[PDB]
Amino acid sequence: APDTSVSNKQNFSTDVIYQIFTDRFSDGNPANNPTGAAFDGTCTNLRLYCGGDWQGIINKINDGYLTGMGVTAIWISQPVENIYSIINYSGVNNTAYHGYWARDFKKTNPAYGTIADFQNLIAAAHAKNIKVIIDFAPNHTSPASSDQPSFAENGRLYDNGTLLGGYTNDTQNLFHHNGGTDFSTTENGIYKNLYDLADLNHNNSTVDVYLKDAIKMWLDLGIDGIRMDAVKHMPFGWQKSFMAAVNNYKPVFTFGEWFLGVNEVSPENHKFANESGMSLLDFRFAQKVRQVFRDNTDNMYGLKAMLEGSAADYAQVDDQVTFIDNHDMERFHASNANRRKLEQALAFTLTSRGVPAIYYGTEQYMSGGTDPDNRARIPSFSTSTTAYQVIQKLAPLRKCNPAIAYGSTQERWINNDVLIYERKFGSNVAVVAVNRNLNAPASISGLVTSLPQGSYNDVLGGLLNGNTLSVGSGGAASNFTLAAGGTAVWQYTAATATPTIGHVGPMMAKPGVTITIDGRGFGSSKGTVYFGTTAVSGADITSWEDTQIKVKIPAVAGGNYNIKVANAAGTASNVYDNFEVLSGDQVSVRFVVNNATTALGQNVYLTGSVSELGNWDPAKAIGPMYNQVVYQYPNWYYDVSVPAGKTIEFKFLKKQGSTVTWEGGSNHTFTAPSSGTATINVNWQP
Numbered sequence: 279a280p281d282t283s284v285s286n287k288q289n290f291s292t293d294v295i296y297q298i299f300t301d302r303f304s305d306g307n308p309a310n311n312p313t314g315a316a317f318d319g320t321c322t323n324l325r326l327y328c329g330g331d332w333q334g335i336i337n338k339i340n341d342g343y344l345t346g347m348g349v350t351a352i353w354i355s356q357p358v359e360n361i362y363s364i365i366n367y368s369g370v371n372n373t374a375y376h377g378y379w380a381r382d383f384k385k386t387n388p389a390y391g392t393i394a395d396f397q398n399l400i401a402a403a404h405a406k407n408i409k410v411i412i413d414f415a416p417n418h419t420s421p422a423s424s425d426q427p428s429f430a431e432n433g434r435l436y437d438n439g440t441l442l443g444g445y446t447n448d449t450q451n452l453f454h455h456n457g458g459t460d461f462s463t464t465e466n467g468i469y470k471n472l473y474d475l476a477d478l479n480h481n482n483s484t485v486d487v488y489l490k491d492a493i494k495m496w497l498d499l500g501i502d503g504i505r506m507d508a509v510k511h512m513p514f515g516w517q518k519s520f521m522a523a524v525n526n527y528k529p530v531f532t533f534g535e536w537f538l539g540v541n542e543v544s545p546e547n548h549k550f551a552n553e554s555g556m557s558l559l560d561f562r563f564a565q566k567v568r569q570v571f572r573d574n575t576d577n578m579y580g581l582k583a584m585l586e587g588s589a590a591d592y593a594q595v596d597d598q599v600t601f602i603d604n605h606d607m608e609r610f611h612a613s614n615a616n617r618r619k620l621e622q623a624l625a626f627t628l629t630s631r632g633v634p635a636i637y638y639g640t641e642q643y644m645s646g647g648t649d650p651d652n653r654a655r656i657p658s659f660s661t662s663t664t665a666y667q668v669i670q671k672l673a674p675l676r677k678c679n680p681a682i683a684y685g686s687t688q689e690r691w692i693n694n695d696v697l698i699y700e701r702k703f704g705s706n707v708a709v710v711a712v713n714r715n716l717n718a719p720a721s722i723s724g725l726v727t728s729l730p731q732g733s734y735n736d737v738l739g740g741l742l743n744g745n746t747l748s749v750g751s752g753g754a755a756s757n758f759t760l761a762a763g764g765t766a767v768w769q770y771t772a773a774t775a776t777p778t779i780g781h782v783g784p785m786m787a788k789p790g791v792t793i794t795i796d797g798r799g800f801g802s803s804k805g806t807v808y809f810g811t812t813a814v815s816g817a818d819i820t821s822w823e824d825t826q827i828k829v830k831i832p833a834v835a836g837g838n839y840n841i842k843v844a845n846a847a848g849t850a851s852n853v854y855d856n857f858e859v860l861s862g863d864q865v866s867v868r869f870v871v872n873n874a875t876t877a878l879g880q881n882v883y884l885t886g887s888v889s890e891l892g893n894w895d896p897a898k899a900i901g902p903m904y905n906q907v908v909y910q911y912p913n914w915y916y917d918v919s920v921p922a923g924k925t926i927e928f929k930f931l932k933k934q935g936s937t938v939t940w941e942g943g944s945n946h947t948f949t950a951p952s953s954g955t956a957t958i959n960v961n962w963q964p
C-alpha cells in the first residue's frame with residue numbers, strides 16, 4: 279500500500295482529521311438515548327445528552343457528508359463507559375455526555391453504542407478510506423469527594439464490571455490524595471487533582487497494568503490512532519512506558535493534549551514531543567493563528583516567527599496536530615465577524631505543515647463561547663457553504679502533493695498583512711498567498727519561487743478571490759495584485775527520482791517491531807535500510823515500494839539512531855534523525871534520592887547504564903527531578919521508563935548549566951521488574 283492508503287496507521291500527515299463530539303453530531307439510534315433528566319432531545323440544554331451516537335456517524339459517512347468534504351480521518355469522543363450520575367454543580371445538572379468521566383476502560387458508553395456498534399463504525403469508516411482516532415483519558419476517572427462518598431460515583435473504577443476501588447477509603451492507593459492543583463508548577467499539576475477529578479496513581483502496579491491492558495483491547499478493535507488527554511498532567515516517564523506498550527504491540531499514531539496559552543512557549547512541551555514517543559496538539563500554532571486571523575493581536579511577522587521557530591523546536595514538526603479551535607476554546611467564527619476570516623484560517627491550516635484537525639461544525643460557521651456553548655448540535659449538513667468547499671478543494675492536496683504533507687516551509691514574500699509561503703518536497707512545490715487585510719489589496723512584486731516557468735491557475739479556482747500566477751525564468755513571478763481578503767494556491771507536481779524520506783513511524787520501539795518509512799523515489803525493487811551504520815536488507819524488509827517501506831528494527835543496542843535508505847541501485851536518501859531504539863519492553867519505575875542538597879538554580883539529575891538512562895552521558899541525564907509534592911527537598915523523585923527485567927547501574931548528579939557534580943562512591947544498582955512498577959530509594963553519596 280502507498281503512504282496515502284487508509285491502512286497506514288503510522289502516518290497522518292497526508293490526512294485531514296474531523297473532530298466529532300459524538301453526542302452532538304447525529305442521533306442514528308434513538309433506542310440508546312438516555313432518558314429523564316439526563317436527556318434533552320432538543321439539545322437546548324448543553325450539559326445533558328442530546329442523543330448523538332456511532333450509528334449517526336455511520337449514517338453521515340454513508341450519505342456522503344464527510345467524504346464529500348475530503349475528510350479522511352475522524353477523531354471521536356472517548357468511547358469507554360462513563361459514570362451514570364447526573365452531577366449538580368451549584369444549580370446546574372451535568373451529565374458525562376462529553377465522555378471524559380470514565381468508570382470502566384474496558385466497556386463502551388451505551389449512549390454511544392455497543393461494541394458491535396463500535397466494530398460497525400470501524401468497518402464503515404475503513405470502507406470509505408477514513409481512519410478512526412479515539413480520545414483516551416487515563417489521567418483520572420470522575421469527580422469525587424473523599425469525604426462525601428455519596429457524591430457522584432466517588433470516582434469509582436471498574437475492571438470490566440469488577441469494582442477495583444473508589445476515592446473514599448482508598449486503602450489500595452489507586453488514586454492521589456494530595457489535594458487539587460493550582461497549576462502553579464508542572465509537578466503540582468501532575469501529582470494533584472485536576473479540579474475534583476479523581477487523579478489516578480500510575481505508580482500503583484494495578485493501575486499501571488490495568489490501563490496498558492485496556493488500551494490493548496481498543497487496539498484489537500481496529501483503531502487507527504489515539505488522542506491522549508491531559509498529557510501535561512501525568513508523569514512523563516510513565517507515559518513513555520505507555521507509548522512503548524502500544525508501539526511494542528500494535529503501533530498507531532498518537533498525539534497528546536498539552537495546553538498552551540497565548541504567547542506561551544514551553545521548553546518542557548518541546549522536550550516531551552521530542553522524547554516521549556508521541557507528538558502533540560499544536561497549541562503554539564493555533565494560538566498564533568487566532569491572534570493573526572481572528573483577534574488581530576499580532577501580524578504576519580509573528581506568524582512567520584512561529585513557523586520558523588516551531589520547525590526548529592520540534593524534532594518532528596510534521597507530526598504536530600494543527601487546529602484553529604476545539605472543544606475548550608471559543609469557536610473561531612464570531613456571529614458578527616466577516617466569514618472570510620474563518621475561510622482564510624482554514625486554507626492556511628490545510629496547506630501548512632503538520633496534521634490538520636477540523637472541529638465539527640466549522641464548515642457550517644458555528645459560533646459559541648466557552649464550554650458548553652462551543653458544543654452545540656451541528657445545525658445542518660449542507661455542502662453549499664464556502665467553508666465546506668474550501669476544505670473540499672484543499673484537503674485532497676495533502677494526498678496528491680507531497681510538498682504539502684512532508685515539505686519544508688519557506689517565506690517568499692511578507693508584510694504586515696500578507697504572507698506568501700512555499701512548501702517543497704522532492705520535485706513537488708506548493709505556493710500559498712494570503713492577504714488578511716479585508717479592506718486593502720496589495721501589490722506583489724519581487725516574488726521568487728521554485729515553480730517552473732509557466733502559468734498557474736489558483737487551485738481554489740478564485741473561490742477566495744485568488745488569481746493566476748505567471749512565473750518567468752528563475753522562478754521569478756511577474757507583478758500582480760493580491761485582492762483584499764485574497765487567498766490563492768499554486769502548485770507543481772512531478773515524479774521524484776531520488777529516494778527521499780518524508781516520514782517514519784513509530785519513532786520509538788524495541789528491536790523486532792516493524793516501522794513504516796514513507797516518502798518518494800524509493801523505486802520498486804528492495805534496496806537497503808540503515809539504522810546508524812547497521813545495514814538491513816533482504817527478508818527483514820517486509821515490503822518495499824516507491825512511496826513506502828516496511829522493515830523490522832534490527833537487534834542493535836538501545837539508543838538514538840539516524841535512518842537512511844538506499845535504492846536498489848545504491849543511491850542513498852536524505853537522513854531522518856531522532857529514531858529511538860529501546861533496550862526492550864518497558865516498565866515505569868520511581869527513583870528517589872535522599873539528602874541531595876543543592877544551591878539555587880542547581881538541580882539533581884539521574885543517569886545510568888542503559889540508553890533509557892542516557893548511558894552515563896550527563897548531557898542526556900534524566901531530570902531535573904521533582905522535590906515538592908510526593909517527596910520534599912532535599913529528597914528528590916522522578917518516574918522513569920526503563921527496560922523491563924534488566925539489572926541497571928545508576929548514579930545521581932547535580933547540574934548547573936552544563937557544569938556537573940557527580941555523586942561519590944560506587945554506582946547504585948538494581949534490577950527492573952518484569953511488569954508493573956517499582957520504587958527505588960537511595961541516599962545521595964558524597
Ligand SMILES: OC[C@H]1O[C@H](O[C@H]2[C@H](O)[C@@H](O)[C@@H](O[C@H]3[C@H](O)[C@@H](O)[C@@H](O[C@H]4[C@H](O)[C@@H](O)[C@@H](O)O[C@@H]4CO)O[C@@H]3CO)O[C@@H]2CO)[C@H](O)[C@@H](O)[C@@H]1O
Nearest residue numbers: 376378415461472473507508509510535537538539606649
Ligand atoms: O468536570 C470535569 C471537566 O472535564 C473535562 O475537561 C477535559 C478537557 O476537555 C480536555 O480537553 C483536557 O483539557 C484540559 C487541559 O488538559 C488542562 O491543561 C487545562 O488547561 C489549563 C492549562 O493547563 C493552563 O496552562 C491554563 O492555560 O488554563 C488551561 C485551562 O484550559 O484544562 C483543560 C480543560 O479542562 O482535560 C480536561 C480533563 O482532562 C470536560 O471538558 C469538562 O466539560 C468537564 O467540566
Ligand SMILES: OC[C@H]1O[C@H](O[C@H]2[C@H](O)[C@@H](O)[C@@H](O)O[C@@H]2CO)[C@H](O)[C@@H](O)[C@@H]1O
Nearest residue numbers: 689690691692693694722723724725726
Ligand atoms: O525578491 C526577493 C525577496 O522577496 C521577498 O521580499 C519582498 C518583501 O517581503 C516585501 O515586503 C517587499 O519588500 O518586496 C520584497 C520583494 O522585493 C522576500 O521576503 C525576501 O526574502 C527575498 O529576498
Ligand SMILES: OC[C@H]1O[C@H](O[C@H]2[C@H](O)[C@@H](O)[C@@H](O)O[C@@H]2CO)[C@H](O)[C@@H](O)[C@@H]1O
Nearest residue numbers: 875876877878879880881904905906911
Ligand atoms: O523545587 C525545585 C527547585 O529545586 C532546587 O531548589 C532548592 C534549592 O537548591 C535549595 O537550596 C533550597 O533553597 O530549596 C529549593 C527547593 O525548594 C533548585 O535549586 C531549583 O532551581 C528548583 O526550582
Ligand SMILES: OC[C@H]1O[C@H](O[C@H]2[C@H](O)[C@@H](O)[C@@H](O)O[C@@H]2CO)[C@H](O)[C@@H](O)[C@@H]1O
Nearest residue numbers: 893894895927929940941942943944945
Ligand atoms: O563515563 C562513564 C562512567 O561514568 C560514571 O563515572 C563517574 C564517576 O562515578 C564519578 O565519581 C566521576 O569520577 O566521574 C565519572 C564520569 O567519568 C560511572 O560511575 C562509571 O561507571 C562510568 O564508566
Ligand SMILES: [Ca+2]
Nearest residue numbers: 307311329331
Ligand atoms: Ca442515540
Ligand SMILES: [Ca+2]
Nearest residue numbers: 468477511512
Ligand atoms: Ca495526574
